[PDB]
Amino acid sequence: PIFLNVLEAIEPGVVCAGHDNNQPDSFAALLSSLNELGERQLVHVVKWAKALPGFRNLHVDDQMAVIQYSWMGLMVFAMGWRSFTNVNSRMLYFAPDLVFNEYRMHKSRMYSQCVRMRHLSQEFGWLQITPQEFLCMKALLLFSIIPVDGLKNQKFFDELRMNYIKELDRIISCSRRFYQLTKLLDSVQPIARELHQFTFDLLIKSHMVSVDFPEMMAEIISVQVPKILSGKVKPIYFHTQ
């Protein structure tokens, strides 16, 4: 099982946010720490993505684009998994040093979004998602958001996405299961969209609320995220929404 060997081998390890848990919870502190965590996780997502089977088949511009469009969904999905495996979805396990209880969900001003993410986490339990299913699904999320007008080399992307769908099917009553997992994958995208909107709005007013955005987060959220929010870049859904 070469493909799964690779996915297990390249899977990122633990990433800490650097949050000072001694400071009282505040919107500014929680969100600044989430932003720094995003910056740290981005580095791991890039290293992981570049090591994926077939990823180098893509035009280099498209390689950069898919990472910049898909990181939110990738990271939410992995976080939901960590939450499921570590705290049985009782809390949102963003990092070992940044675990959200209900009070933090409220103080972050993202309670509705957190609810949805906790629901996703719970789905890993409700569906008895296996580690191997998780890894294949997560890889597929890298190839699940593209420009409406297409990538630089659309053909190489289409082929790559096709093969990752095939890898998922082979890891998979089979029709029921495939239906379930594709439905779960689709469910990530509306969550990512709500977070895209939230973080964009936050960046714009960040100076007024003392929220710090690191360099790559600020760049990506101002240059790439608006392409999604303006409708130039859209998720690929399995099922019609």
Binding site: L42, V43, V46, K47, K50, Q63, M64, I67, Q68, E215, M216, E219, I220
Partner: peptide, 10 residues
């Protein structure tokens, strides 16, 4: 250029 710099640096 910050993302591209990261991407090209490994």
């Amino acid at each position: 250029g910050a993302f591209q710099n990261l991407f090209q640096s490994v």
